[PDB]
Amino acid sequence: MDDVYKTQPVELFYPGYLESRGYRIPALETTKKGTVLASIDVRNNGDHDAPNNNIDVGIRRKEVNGEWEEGKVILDYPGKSAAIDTSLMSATIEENGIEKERIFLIVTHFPEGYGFPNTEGGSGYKEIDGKYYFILKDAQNNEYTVREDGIVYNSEGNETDYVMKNDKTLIQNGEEVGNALLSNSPLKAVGTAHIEMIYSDDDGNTWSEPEDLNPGLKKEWMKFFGTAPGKGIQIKNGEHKGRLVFPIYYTNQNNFQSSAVIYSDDFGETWKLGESPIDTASVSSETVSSGTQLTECQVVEMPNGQLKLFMRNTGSYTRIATSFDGGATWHDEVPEDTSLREPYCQLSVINYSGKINGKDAIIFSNPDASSRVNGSVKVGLINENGTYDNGEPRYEFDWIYNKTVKPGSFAYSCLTELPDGNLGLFYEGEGAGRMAYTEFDLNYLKFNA
Numbered sequence: 001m002d003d004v005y006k007t008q009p010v011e012l013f014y015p016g017y018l019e020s021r022g023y024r025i026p027a028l029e030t031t032k033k034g035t036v037l038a039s040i041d042v043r044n045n046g047d048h049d050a051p052n053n054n055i056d057v058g059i060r061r062k063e064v065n066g067e068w069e070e071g072k073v074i075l076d077y078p079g080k081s082a083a084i085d086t087s088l089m090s091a092t093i094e095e096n097g098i099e100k101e102r103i104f105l106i107v108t109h110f111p112e113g114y115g116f117p118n119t120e121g122g123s124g125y126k127e128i129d130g131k132y133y134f135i136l137k138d139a140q141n142n143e144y145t146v147r148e149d150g151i152v153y154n155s156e157g158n159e160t161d162y163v164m165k166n167d168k169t170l171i172q173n174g175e176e177v178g179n180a181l182l183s184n185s186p187l188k189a190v191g192t193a194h195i196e197m198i199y200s201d202d203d204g205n206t207w208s209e210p211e212d213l214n215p216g217l218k219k220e221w222m223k224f225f226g227t228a229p230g231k232g233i234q235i236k237n238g239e240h241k242g243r244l245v246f247p248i249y250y251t252n253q254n255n256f257q258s259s260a261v262i263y264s265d266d267f268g269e270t271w272k273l274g275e276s277p278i279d280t281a282s283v284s285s286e287t288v289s290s291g292t293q294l295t296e297c298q299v300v301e302m303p304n305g306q307l308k309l310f311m312r313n314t315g316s317y318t319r320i321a322t323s324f325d326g327g328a329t330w331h332d333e334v335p336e337d338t339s340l341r342e343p344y345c346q347l348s349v350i351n352y353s354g355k356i357n358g359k360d361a362i363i364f365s366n367p368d369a370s371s372r373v374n375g376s377v378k379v380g381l382i383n384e385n386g387t388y389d390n391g392e393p394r395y396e397f398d399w400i401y402n403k404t405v406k407p408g409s410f411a412y413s414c415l416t417e418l419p420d421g422n423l424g425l426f427y428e429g430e431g432a433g434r435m436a437y438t439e440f441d442l443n444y445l446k447f448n449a
């Protein structure tokens with residue numbers, strides 16, 4: 001205790017804050033300017049997942065040597081159309097002679113009446129030539145496409161008297177007749193999972209309008225397709241320096257869940273979908289229908305740029321996948337780590353910028369139990385141990401520290417490194433829909449009660 005740092009937990013979001021009855025799914029990221037960003041599900045109708053819940057994106061900022069600022073809703077869809085599970089990423093690009101910083105946020109989006117349990121398949125788009133067009137359905141399940149200037153075309157390629165604005169509002173004869181995201185609209189969007197993206201150029205003050213990442217990225221055979229909540233990373237070393245890496249997961253036609261990442265090499269302008277660790281020489285994540293499912297995940301980078309994907313799964317212990325091509329593919333051996341008991345809950349893992357006992361290190365946090373209790377933060381030392389049959393080296397984890405930071409209820413959490421080398425933790429567990437945040441140092445993790 002004598003030399004340890006640990007702040008008493010504070011509530012950043014709670015029932016009633018921003019008029020919301022519920023809050024869930026914490027995400028935490030630090031900017032290059034030292035600002036801490038805390039995004040959350042603004043679950044206005046209660047703690048339940050989609051569907052039947054008006055969920056929005058909220059965020060709070062804490063600049064270096066400053067207080068937590070007021071929370072703001074930065075993405076809000078009509079009715080009970082949900083924006084659920086957010087992920088944050090601070091990333092930079094060498095501009096003219098200025099290294100400029102942009103903050104990325106991706107979130108899963110459902111139209112009204114839909115969520116993970118009842119999602120349909122498809123991207124929500126139809127491809128004509130090389131252009132993807134937003135699909136709309138009438139009550140008779142006929143198909144329409146939104147094209148130039150928002151004009152709605154029918155299945156025969158002829159124009160209707162409908163226009164859809166970018167916020168999915170439907171105009172007919174100069175009158176607003178509905179919104180494509182609502183259960184009561186004459187023309188509805190496909191009831192399927194989207195990943196939407198927003199970005200901020202001013203250290204998190206203001207955010208762009210959502211950009212749908214589905215077209216050309218989500219496979220038509222996918223049903224669920226959504227953000228793995230927490231954070232993404234920008235690769236710092238190796239062949240793929242600068243690549244943005246965002247953990248996601250999806251389901252195929254058998255509703256089997258598979259983890260993956262989407263990545264960008266043009267600073268978020270375009271995105272590509274990498275393989276799942278489910279995808280091997282033997283197994284295809286498109287057609288698999290049995291075995292261990294891999295769902296929510298987080299990614300950390302090795303000293304040479306090698307990627308490690310930590311995955312929530314239907315097994316007892318955390319699964320870790322290894323990528324040699326910046327997340328495009330994963331080594332076909334995906335082992336457990338018997339030091340990371342995994343009771344089917346989201347986890348957090350991050351890179352640590354400084355050496356710990358002369359080694360590069362990562363930090364891990366999850367409920368270390370057979371249920372969502374005993375929130376524990378672990379420190380992993382990185383050790384080389386030979387190379388692969390290929391040329392790339394082999395990294396292993398030494399879990400030296402394993403500190404309980406929440407003996408009672410503990411669910412979703414997200415770590416981040418503070419500008420001073422300390423650690424922040426945005427976690428569920430304090431009860432009554434309260435989203436808690438605490439700070440501590442490495443000595444707090446070394447202490448063994």
Ligand SMILES: CC(=O)N[C@H]1[C@H]([C@H](O)[C@H](O)CO)O[C@@](O)(C(=O)O)C[C@@H]1O
Pocket residue numbers: 025049050084085108115116226295296344345
């Ligand atoms: C999009 C969505 O629904 N995400 C939710 C996930 C998924 O439902 C599961 O990963 C699917 O198996 O699970 C939670 O319910 C949970 O267990 O805390 C909360 C989270 O918001």
Ligand SMILES: [Cl-]
Pocket residue numbers: 402403404447448449
């Ligand atoms: Cl302890």
Ligand SMILES: [Cl-]
Pocket residue numbers: 431432433
């Ligand atoms: Cl509760």
